[PDB]
Design an enzyme around this catalytic site. Structure first.
Site, mmCIF file in Angstrom:
data_model
loop_
_atom_site.group_PDB
_atom_site.id
_atom_site.type_symbol
_atom_site.label_atom_id
_atom_site.label_comp_id
_atom_site.label_asym_id
_atom_site.label_seq_id
_atom_site.Cartn_x
_atom_site.Cartn_y
_atom_site.Cartn_z
ATOM 1 N N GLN A 28 30.536 -10.794 -57.227
ATOM 2 C CA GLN A 28 31.554 -9.767 -56.975
ATOM 3 C C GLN A 28 32.844 -10.326 -57.746
ATOM 4 O OE1 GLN A 28 31.852 -7.128 -53.842
ATOM 5 N NE2 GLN A 28 33.930 -7.411 -53.862
ATOM 6 N N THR A 41 26.176 -15.631 -54.069
ATOM 7 C CA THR A 41 26.021 -15.727 -55.550
ATOM 8 C C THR A 41 26.923 -16.407 -56.088
ATOM 9 O OG1 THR A 41 25.189 -13.465 -55.563
ATOM 10 C CG2 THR A 41 25.693 -14.400 -57.545
ATOM 11 N N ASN A 56 43.351 -9.118 -58.547
ATOM 12 C CA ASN A 56 42.693 -9.250 -59.855
ATOM 13 C C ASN A 56 43.881 -9.257 -61.425
ATOM 14 O OD1 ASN A 56 40.520 -9.994 -58.378
ATOM 15 N ND2 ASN A 56 39.548 -7.950 -58.862
ATOM 16 N N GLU A 67 40.420 -30.329 -75.239
ATOM 17 C CA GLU A 67 41.766 -30.693 -75.070
ATOM 18 C C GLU A 67 42.170 -30.392 -73.495
ATOM 19 O OE1 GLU A 67 43.998 -29.414 -78.455
ATOM 20 O OE2 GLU A 67 45.726 -30.063 -77.421
HETATM 21 N N1 LIG Z 1 40.594 -12.647 -55.844
HETATM 22 C C1 LIG Z 1 39.176 -11.933 -55.526
HETATM 23 N N2 LIG Z 1 38.446 -12.239 -54.593
HETATM 24 C C2 LIG Z 1 37.358 -11.855 -54.328
HETATM 25 C C3 LIG Z 1 36.996 -10.684 -54.887
HETATM 26 N N3 LIG Z 1 35.864 -10.083 -54.576
HETATM 27 C C4 LIG Z 1 35.380 -10.865 -53.655
HETATM 28 N N4 LIG Z 1 36.243 -12.104 -53.475
HETATM 29 C C5 LIG Z 1 36.027 -13.216 -52.321
HETATM 30 O O1 LIG Z 1 34.817 -13.590 -52.588
HETATM 31 C C6 LIG Z 1 34.536 -14.035 -51.401
HETATM 32 C C7 LIG Z 1 33.203 -13.602 -51.154
HETATM 33 O O2 LIG Z 1 32.437 -13.569 -52.299
HETATM 34 P P1 LIG Z 1 31.827 -12.485 -53.243
HETATM 35 O O3 LIG Z 1 32.101 -12.898 -54.688
HETATM 36 O O4 LIG Z 1 32.297 -11.341 -52.759
HETATM 37 O O5 LIG Z 1 30.177 -12.551 -53.081
HETATM 38 P P2 LIG Z 1 29.024 -12.703 -54.206
HETATM 39 O O6 LIG Z 1 29.554 -13.833 -55.155
HETATM 40 O O7 LIG Z 1 28.942 -11.464 -54.706
HETATM 41 O O8 LIG Z 1 27.829 -13.505 -53.521
HETATM 42 P P3 LIG Z 1 26.870 -12.460 -52.497
HETATM 43 O O9 LIG Z 1 27.615 -11.224 -52.568
HETATM 44 O O10 LIG Z 1 26.947 -13.246 -51.011
HETATM 45 O O11 LIG Z 1 25.767 -12.240 -53.067
HETATM 46 C C8 LIG Z 1 35.598 -13.650 -50.188
HETATM 47 O O12 LIG Z 1 36.457 -14.667 -49.920
HETATM 48 C C9 LIG Z 1 36.653 -12.733 -51.182
HETATM 49 O O13 LIG Z 1 37.863 -12.758 -50.616
HETATM 50 C C10 LIG Z 1 37.957 -10.168 -55.929
HETATM 51 O O14 LIG Z 1 37.511 -8.982 -56.578
HETATM 52 N N5 LIG Z 1 38.808 -10.649 -56.265
HETATM 53 MG MG LIG Z 2 27.963 -9.725 -53.807
#
Ligand SMILES: Nc1nc2c(ncn2[C@@H]2O[C@H](COP(=O)(O)OP(=O)(O)OP(=O)(O)O)[C@@H](O)[C@H]2O)c(=O)[nH]1
Ligand SMILES: [Mg+2]
Ligand SMILES: Nc1ncnc2c1ncn2[C@@H]1O[C@H](COP(=O)(O)OP(=O)(O)CP(=O)(O)O)[C@@H](O)[C@H]1O
Ligand SMILES: Nc1nc2c(ncn2[C@@H]2O[C@H](COP(=O)(O)OP(=O)(O)O)[C@@H](O)[C@H]2O)c(=O)[nH]1
Ligand SMILES: COC(=O)Nc1nc2ccc(C(=O)c3cccs3)cc2[nH]1
Ligand SMILES: [Ca+2]
Ligand SMILES: [Mg+2]
EC number: 3.6.5.-
Lengths: 437, 54, 427, 334
Positions: free
Chosen positions: A11, A145, A228, A254
């Site tokens: 995500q 993920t 973001n 670099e």
């Molecule tokens: N800066 C930022 N952080 C994010 C965002 N979405 C999720 N996070 C952070 O990512 C962490 C959660 O991981 P995710 O990336 O949402 O989960 P994933 O990579 O999809 O993995 P799974 O859902 O477990 O399969 C939390 O600490 C959130 O604060 C985003 O859009 N921007």
């Molecule tokens: Mg996810």
């Protein structure tokens, strides 16, 4: 020209990828449908922007990017978003159910079933590359993920693309905007497995971005969207040298050369200024000195820590806008005499400066005001080890009670990998301290 | 103090100012790790199914 | 992200029906099954609990189970009775006589395959089934005995699917028969092994709330079930509406359950409302937060001050300042940080949904994983032992093929569960 | 109701402070490793600064300045002085000192040792107190430790009656706004033995902290002369006051040391904040010139003053950050 492939995982990675590619299009004059009216070489070319975009005979410029999530909700918002035409279906890879904030599920269980597909779609991008530099990889530490699948992907990329460079943009976990509790596990696990496979990694702590949004953008409760757009500005500042004409950081290689003398210690601190609210009806534009000095205020860093109590190994200043070398040096001279800036004895005390005359592009309707000049400082200070200290402490608190561990063991992971990962992090903290004090 | 390697172009310029001088796993092992974890899952699942059979 | 719902027994079908009527109203579904609402937010995740029927009707993914037709006939003639898929009504005739053995070993065993057929038929239609939920009591025979038999067989056929239960605990205050501690104790061990979440809905607490707080001098099962359906709506808001949270059942459980056996939750709700009795002033956010942490809003009749919180989840519903929510939540913790374990960092999590439930401008649902829940199991254990000492009422069970040993085992593994909670309370 | 933790049990000062906080009923103590604190009375070694200020919605404060050890170590203080333009190296109020390592500025030290060997002078030094360079250097080489060689003040101001030696201890509190507060009450840690010019291993004669001395309690209770008496003495015996003759210099020295390191340790724009209590040790020569001996980052107080100082610490360092539902400090302005 040498091409760069962007990989967005989970995500966090996907949504940040979207914000960045949106910003890229605005900067290079690329429309949502992929047309670039200023590109006079229809159907191809090897300009600097071609590092990130390839071209179709019809004149469409498409991102050298692949999106991968183990669950379709977020990537579906790319498929139907305002930049839907920009990408083609084979760039967007979705699973059925996600890793549930479980590294082991991201790495072993689900990761094994989809890794070959991802590498295949990546291969098709690499085939259209005359000379591939390597990869920019976006992901969170906390997601199953983002942590699990990414570390597996990085391992295989080192196999299928041995001499290519790999850079990370990594979102460090912050309780303020997270409803997870197991992120310290996932972070340590993914850092341990990825460490040898990453040449340079830019950590972004959501805590820092959150507070910058509150303090400087006057957003009371910052959303992922607010976070973001700001992150994309910083990322853009870091990659601009790859997309524009210049002589500093023109290759992925670099980045290691200029920022990473010691391989394991490849986590540069990013500091950005100025951040000005678009709702600020009257703003006095800041000078070169003012924005450069702000690069040494902890409140502007991507990771909150104190560089005064560490040592620098390298330092790059990346300016955008109305800036000339004279005013930079005049600023540096004053900052040097007023601030605590200590380099390690085996490194020269100095700054590599890059200037791009085009001021930072802002997203229309965004929260950021247009400014006449901006700067991003990339510094490799040992002070960023404070972030590992925080994380490892949270890890230690939970793992002593084996809290949540059964979730990982149940997906086929062995308990010893926890301790192996934690020991590697223990070694890393000590590497930083030897260098730092 | 000393400004070196100044490079200029239409898009901008770069240079370096010095304040002072100084003083992997293979595909085989990867696929073996992934398959060792898959076995542990299948063993754990079989222990559950045997338990339910009892 | 479909969820398959199962309701077993008298209590299970009565709170289950209540649940479906509450969330159907929230999603704008009428008893005919037709959508008439005014927000697309009502339909964005309606497939989680509802199946789409040709001729745009929405049919609850619900399976109704009993060993006697009495309560299910009441359901079919109920307000939303006709919304359920008629083939999903699975019932025997003999009843279970408040007997765990009859539900789990004899009468229930004869019917359990038929139920699984319907489960399978509903599962094979799911694009990606995220899990099951079950409503039932532990004090009777069908919900307790056949419900846990069902759970065991579902885990056999779907070993990688989440199973969550809303389980009504028996209490002498609200009691049908004297053998309820027997049935509950036998059921608790099944739940320890084969569920990911068990919401411990104590009839004692539900009674006390209706009496001491809602000022209802003679509460019925209907009054008690109003609290249950209101809580279940809140617990599943996360899954039914778009918002901050879009975790599937597994991700939700991962962040709430640090140890596999300790997955018995203390639910809570604010503001506490009796049915029909309107009241017009909405609660301020400090009022919501203080009430949902107060023992008087707990539905498990355990004192949270007598234990420690492993994890806490709170979902706030309505139009409100989440910044103010943030401050009040971190107020409560930082005030009482001795009732939270310190070896699970940031173990108190919050989320908001814009859509409030019917009748309230704002509300909050509490989900506590506290070690204080051991008081519930100690209570059942004492009542179990008081009869089992003299082998009282055991003939009802031995007559169905059960041995005293199975009781001795059940007794022992609940005492283990109790001591396991004590281990982490003193950490 | 604010929260705090205690990670240094052997702190005389903050044991007193924590009890004062509890007795207000608006402060609750947590145990050592609870991260949800407002105030941290931290340990003196390996204090985890990197973990402070990362708890959402919690203002965090710690009773130590990160980096202030460069002032509070003898090897560091000499180097901090010597390399800082604000102080050094013609610094008139700090004795001539050199950094020496066991087998560095060893060659530099004997270049000085020689020239008033090479004509006129007292050439007594300290780490042991000697007059022979060689006698020090292999003292230093079989300690193990890193030591500091400093010029010995051969002409100290001597109290009468008794012909005694003394050093002055000042307590300085620096708050989160980097206000520098000097505690109006100092103490003279006097020698009970009369000062012996000729023989130097007398050490009871030449070293003045209130450990060695236990002729004790002869002149004043506990070989501790406070400011009212010492002032009266200066008026009667020297026709001057403590303020003019000594305190102006003390205030000047304190302010200068802390202003020098301010940019290195300030928490004005940090995510957490610091305050710290220091103990400045001074030495007065016979011409009423003040010399800085050293600085302690974890000082103890004198027994009569514990009640006042620790109450002062709560008022201006802690309650200034966390308020509750004429002054004993002198603010050194800058
Ligand atoms: N800066 C930022 N952080 C994010 C965002 N979405 C999720 N996070 C952070 O990512 C962490 C959660 O991981 P995710 O990336 O949402 O989960 P994933 O990579 O999809 O993995 P799974 O859902 O477990 O399969 C939390 O600490 C959130 O604060 C985003 O859009 N921007
Ligand atoms: Mg996810
Ligand atoms: N340069 C000098 N000239 C004369 N006397 C000196 C001196 N340096 C130190 N002394 C005397 O030696 C004693 C010991 O000095 P020092 O200050 O190193 O001890 P110490 O570290 O225990 C002080 P504190 O306990 O407050 O930290 C001082 O009390 C002072 O009387
Ligand atoms: N909260 C609640 N509890 C009930 C209800 N009906 C029965 N119970 C409780 O459930 C237990 C009896 O179980 P029951 O469901 O009637 O047996 P079953 O039909 O064989 O599963 C007793 O503890 C009752 O107090 C109800 O509608 N609501
Ligand atoms: C039908 O099964 C469930 O609804 N289980 C369930 N488990 C849950 C755990 C947490 C939450 C929730 O709403 C959260 C609010 C803030 C952080 S989690 C919601 C949940 N629902
Ligand atoms: Ca072109
Ligand atoms: Mg009944």
């Amino acid at each position: 020209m040498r091409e760069c492939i962007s990989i967005h995982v989970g995500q966090a990675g996907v949504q940040i990828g979207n914000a960045c590619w949106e910003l890229y299009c605005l900067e290079h004059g690329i429309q949502p449908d992929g047309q670039m009216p200023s590109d006079k070489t229809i159907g191809g070319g090897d300009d600097s922007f071609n590092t990130f975009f390839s071209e179709t005979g019809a004149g469409k410029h498409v991102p050298r990017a692949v999106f991968v999530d183990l669950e379709p909700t977020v990537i579906d918002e790319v498929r139907t978003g305002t930049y839907r035409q920009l990408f083609h279906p084979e760039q967007l890879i979705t699973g059925k159910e996600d890793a549930a904030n479980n590294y082991a599920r991201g790495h072993y269980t689900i990761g094994k079933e989809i890794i070959d597909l991802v590498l295949d779609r990546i291969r098709k991008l690499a085939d259209q590359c005359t000379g591939l530099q390597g990869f920019l990889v976006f992901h969170s530490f906390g997601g199953g993920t983002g942590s699990g699948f990414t570390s597996l992907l990085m391992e295989r990329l080192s196999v299928d693309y041995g001499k290519k460079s790999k850079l990370e943009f990594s979102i460090y976990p912050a309780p303020q905007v997270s409803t997870a509790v197991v992120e310290p596990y996932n972070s340590i696990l993914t850092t341990h497995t990825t460490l040898e496979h990453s040449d340079c990694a830019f950590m972004v702590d959501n805590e820092a971005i959150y507070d910058i949004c509150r303090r400087n953008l006057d957003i009371e409760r910052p959303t992922y969207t607010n976070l973001n757009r700001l992150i994309s500005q910083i990322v853009s500042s870091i990659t601009a040298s790859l997309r524009f004409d210049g002589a500093l950081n023109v290759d992925l290689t670099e980045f290691q050369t200029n920022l990473v003398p010691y391989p394991r210690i490849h986590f540069p601190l990013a500091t950005y200024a100025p951040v000005i609210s678009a709702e600020k009806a009257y703003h006095e534009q800041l000078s070169v000195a003012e924005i450069t000095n702000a690069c040494f205020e902890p409140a502007n860093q991507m990771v909150k820590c104190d560089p005064r109590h560490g040592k620098y190994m390298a330092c790059c200043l990346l300016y955008r806008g109305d800036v000339v070398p004279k005013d930079v040096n005049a600023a540096i001279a004053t900052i040097k005499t007023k601030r605590s800036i200590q380099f390690v004895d085996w490194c020269p005390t100095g700054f590599k400066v890059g200037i791009n005359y085009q001021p930072p592009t802002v997203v229309p309707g965004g929260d950021l005001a247009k400014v006449q000049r901006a700067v991003c400082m990339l510094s490799n200070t040992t002070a960023i080890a404070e972030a590992w200290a925080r994380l490892d402490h949270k890890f230690d608190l939970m793992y002593a009670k084996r809290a949540f561990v059964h979730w990982y063991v149940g997906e086929g992971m062995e308990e010893g990998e926890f301790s192996e990962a934690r020991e590697d992090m223990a070694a890393l903290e000590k590497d930083y301290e030897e260098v730092g004090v | 103090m000393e400004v070196i390697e100044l490079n200029k172009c239409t898009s901008g310029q770069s240079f370096e100012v010095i304040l002072k001088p100084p003083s992997d796993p293979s595909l085989e092992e990867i696929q073996k790790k992934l398959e060792a974890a898959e076995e542990r899952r299948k063993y754990q699942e079989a222990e559950l199914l045997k338990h339910l059979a009892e | 992200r479909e969820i398959v719902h199962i309701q077993a027994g008298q209590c299970g079908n009565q709170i289950g029906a209540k649940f479906w009527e509450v969330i159907s109203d929230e999603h704008g579904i009428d008893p005919t099954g037709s959508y008439h609402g005014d927000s697309d937010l009502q339909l964005e995740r309606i497939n989680v609990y509802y199946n789409e029927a040709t001729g745009n009707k929405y049919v609850p993914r619900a399976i109704l189970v009993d060993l006697e037709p009495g309560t299910m006939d009441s359901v079919r003639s109920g307000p939303f009775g006709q919304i359920f898929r008629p083939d999903n009504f699975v019932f025997g005739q003999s009843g279970a006589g408040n007997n765990w053995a009859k539900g789990h070993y004899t009468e229930g065993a004869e019917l359990v395959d038929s139920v699984l057929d319907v489960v399978r038929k509903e599962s094979e239609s799911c694009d990606c089934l995220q899990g099951f939920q079950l409503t039932h009591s532990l004090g009777g025979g069908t919900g307790s005995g056949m419900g846990t038999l069902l759970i065991s067989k579902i885990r056999e056929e779907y070993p990688d699917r989440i199973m969550n239960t809303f389980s009504v605990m028996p209490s002498p205050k609200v009691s049908d028969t004297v053998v309820e501690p027997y049935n509950a104790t036998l059921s608790v061990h099944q739940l320890v092994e084969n569920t990911d979440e068990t919401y411990c809905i104590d009839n004692e607490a539900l009674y006390d709330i209706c009496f001491r707080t809602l000022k209802l001098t003679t509460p019925t099962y209907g009054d008690l079930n109003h609290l249950v359906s209101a809580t279940m709506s809140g617990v599943t808001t996360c899954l039914r509406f778009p918002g901050q949270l879009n975790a599937d059942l597994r991700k939700l459980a991962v962040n709430m359950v640090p140890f596999p056996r300790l997955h018995f939750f203390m639910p809570g709700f604010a503001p506490l409302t009796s049915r029909g009795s309107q009241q017009y002033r909405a609660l301020t956010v400090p009022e919501l937060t203080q009430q949902m942490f107060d023992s008087k809003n707990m539905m498990a009749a355990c004192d949270p001050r007598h234990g420690r919180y492993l994890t806490v989840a709170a979902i706030f519903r309505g139009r409100m300042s989440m910044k103010e929510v943030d401050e009040q939540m971190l107020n409560v913790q930082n005030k009482n940080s001795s009732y939270f374990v310190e070896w699970i960092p940031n173990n108190v999590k919050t989320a908001v949904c814009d859509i409030p439930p019917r009748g309230l401008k704002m509300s909050a649902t509490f989900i506590g994983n506290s070690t204080a829940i051991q008081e519930l199991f100690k209570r059942i254990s004492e009542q179990f032992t008081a009869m089992f000492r003299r082998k009282a009422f055991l003939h009802w069970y031995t007559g169905e093929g059960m041995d005293e040993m199975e009781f001795t085992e059940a007794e022992s593994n609940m005492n283990d569960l109790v001591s396991e909670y004590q281990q982490y309370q003193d950490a | 109701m604010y929260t705090f933790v205690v990670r240094d049990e052997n702190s005389s000062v903050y044991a007193e402070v924590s009890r004062l906080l509890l007795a207000t009923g608006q402060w609750k103590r947590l145990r050592k490793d609870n991260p949800r604190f407002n105030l941290m009375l931290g340990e003196r070694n390996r204090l985890p600064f990197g973990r402070l200020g990362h708890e959402p919605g919690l203002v965090q404060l710690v009773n130590y300045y990160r980096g202030a050890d460069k002032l509070c170590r003898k090897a560091s203080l000499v180097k901090l002085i010597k390399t800082s333009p604000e102080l050094s190296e013609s610094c008139t109020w700090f004795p001539e000192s050199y950094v020496i390592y066991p087998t560095d500025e060893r060659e530099v030290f004997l270049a000085a040792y020689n020239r008033r060997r090479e004509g006129r002078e007292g050439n007594v030094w300290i780490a042991l107190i000697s007059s022979e360079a060689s006698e020090l250097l292999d003292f230093i080489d079989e300690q193990g430790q890193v030591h500091v060689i400093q010029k010995y003040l051969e002409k100290p101001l001597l109290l009468e009656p008794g012909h005694r030696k003394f050093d002055i201890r000042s307590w300085v509190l620096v708050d989160h706004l980097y206000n520098i507060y000097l505690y109006r009450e100092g103490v003279l840690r006097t020698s009970s033995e009369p000062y012996n010019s000729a023989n130097f291993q007398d050490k009871t004669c030449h070293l003045t902290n209130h450990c060695i001395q236990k002729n004790y309690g002869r002149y004043e209770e506990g070989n501790e002369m406070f400011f009212e008496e010492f002032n009266q003495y200066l008026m009667d015996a020297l026709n001057t006051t403590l303020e003019n003759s000594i305190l102006l210099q003390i205030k000047h020295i304190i302010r200068s040391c802390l202003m020098c390191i301010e940019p290195a340790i300030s928490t004005k724009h940090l995510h957490y904040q610091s305050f710290q209590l220091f103990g400045f040790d001074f030495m007065v020569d016979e011409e009423l010139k003040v010399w800085l001996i050293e600085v302690n980052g974890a000082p103890a107080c004198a027994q009569k003053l514990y009640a006042e100082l620790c109450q002062g610490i709560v008022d201006v360092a802690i309650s200034s950050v966390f308020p509750l539902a004429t002054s004993i400090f002198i603010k050194l302005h800058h």
